[PDB]
């Protein structure tokens, strides 16, 4: 058993990936080579690529995209890499045409979690609480039912880029113009105040198991939740889990505000360091970071 | 300009896409290359592509994937493949890495339109009229929330493979485990009888337009027009669903007409694109000629 590690990649979270690599690298218990996209798009293999890992940034690569990298020498490959050209489906299509077996969701899940408004057609539609929302498209005027405040963001983007809160009609189209720098779709959703922001993780392919419920205030693990709210968070997340045929893991995120719960969003590759909320959350179920490693895999191999 | 066409593929579909690819060199008006990907994975290039062309079909290629293709030399990407690795987003995720503009469905919209269940499921949030139905996944005893008769599908798939009508619930065991022959996900759907199956083409990014409307017929073909009392509503349902998908480019969309009611089946962002597709001619009753709508197909990548 040989894993190739991507970390790296052209989004934002391109050093929290290769923080989180640096977590892996150290801990995963299989023989395991690192390859790195740098943010110009470029790729780094080998010895290039640990010396950028120690760098905590890769701004130039040497081979573009596709890499001669010898694939055939790995038998699962974990791409660590987070937002666009990372948890979007489109690194993962490629690995479905090398016939290479991967860690994490599928192209469709994937694609899917990481699309803000889909995400949340599939979810209410399956009965999984989300906060009230609208799609606006690029090109044509908004229509949004409810008041302000709202909240706007790109519908595929992430690391919070282009997102705002707006608290009167006359922001909004500023509002939509920057979310549409980044996107062709954006999500206008009620803007919850107060909130809480409680995190859980989900291991397994499509039917998983969730582990204790953090909150993020410094991460409270685990989350001042009573009993019956803490049973829902897992029990939601589980669901959608499910229904979004998501593979591998994901972080669920909810908010919870006058005692109601929205799931906010599913995170198909979370922040991997050992001090991570997904890692930490695990360990706090039982399942040390090796062990979690060792899981990851196997599961990409069924 | 500089097109690349790519046909062929690894699905049962392989001899269907190059007959397309074949109506579509004959009339695209840019200057175009063929790449064909061989029932074995592996592709082929310049001429042995067009021999493949030839044959009608390629068992066997010569180029590993990723092919060692000059992709630089191409301004669109145009791939004509079917079901797996074709239009489930898998290819065009391969495509928005090399940074390359490509004809039709994105990665999500791809991915979401093959999929029976997931589509169906935005589709009805969305207002739009579906076939009521349940997701059964292999693992977990199915509850359907009505009798019988229905059909059992898988989720994922082609050429309509793995289908069945159940009349007795205790015949739905065996048509999931036929079902699940070619898919981990089925669908069960409350079975309309009779039916008329209508189709309506789509142009266009996300905000299309909609072609005359035809009705399909099995012979022991398409009408189009459509003998319809309703055109307008189904291509209003059209196009409202290809907004909320995002649809890019082009889709095909299905749908049933039973008891004076419309559902939509499903939408195909890869159809048939021979002179006498069902997509093809759609258009062309609706003034769009064949060499026309490839133009505006590859342009469309563009923007
Ligand atoms: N509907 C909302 N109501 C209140 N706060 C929100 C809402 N949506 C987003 N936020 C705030 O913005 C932050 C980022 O939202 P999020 O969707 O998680 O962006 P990203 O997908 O990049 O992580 C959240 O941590 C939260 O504090
Ligand atoms: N809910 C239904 N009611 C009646 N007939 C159906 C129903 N679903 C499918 N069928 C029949 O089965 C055939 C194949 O189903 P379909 O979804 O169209 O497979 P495909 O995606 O290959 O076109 C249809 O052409 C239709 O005649």
């Known amino acids: 058993m040989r894993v190739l590690l991507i970390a790296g990649g052209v989004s934002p979270e391109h050093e929290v990936s290769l923080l ?21 798009g470029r790729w780094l293999l080998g010895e290039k690529a640990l010396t950028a890992l120690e760098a905590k940034a890769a701004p130039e690569g040497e081979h573009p995209f596709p890499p001669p990298l010898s694939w055939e020498r790995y038998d699962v490959v974990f791409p660590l890499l987070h937002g666009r050209f990372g948890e979007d489906g489109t690194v993962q299509g490629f690995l479905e045409l090398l016939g290479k077996p991967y860690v994490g969701a599928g192209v469709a899940a994937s694609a899917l979690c990481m699309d803000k408004d889909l995400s949340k057609r599939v979810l209410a539609q399956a009965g999984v609480p989300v906060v009230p929302w609208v799609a606006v498209r690029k090109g044509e005027p908004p229509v949004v039912p409810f008041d302000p405040p709202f909240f706007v963001k790109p519908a595929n983007t992430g690391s919070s880029v282009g997102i705002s ?23 206008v959703e009620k803007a919850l105040s107060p909130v809480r922001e409680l995190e859980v993780g989900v291991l397994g392919n499509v039917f998983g ?28 997340a589980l669901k959608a889990y499910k229904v979004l045929g998501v593979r591998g893991m ?19 590759i979370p ?29 990409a191999l069924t």
Not at 22 to 37: K, N, Q, S, Y
Not at 250 to 268: M, S
Not at 284 to 297: C, H, I, K, S
């Open 20 to 40: 989180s690599a640096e977590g892996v690298l150290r801990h995963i218990p299989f023989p395991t080579d690192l390859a790195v996209i740098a943010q110009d």
């Open 250 to 268: 994901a972080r669920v995120d909810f908010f919870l505000a006058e005692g109601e719960l929205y799931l906010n969003e599913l995170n198909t």
């Open 165 to 187: 809160r707006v608290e009167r009609f006359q922001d909004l189209e500023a509002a939509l113009a920057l979310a549409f720098r980044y996107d062709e779709k954006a999500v």
């Open 209 to 236: 198991e969730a582990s204790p419920v953090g909150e993020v205030r410094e991460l409270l693990i685990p989350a001042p939740l009573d009993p019956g709210t803490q049973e829902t968070v897992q029990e939601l």
């Open 271 to 299: 922040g991997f360091t050992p001090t991570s909320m997904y890692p930490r959350l695990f360990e706090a179920g039982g399942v040390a970071y090796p062990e979690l490693l060792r899981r990851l895999v196997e599961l």
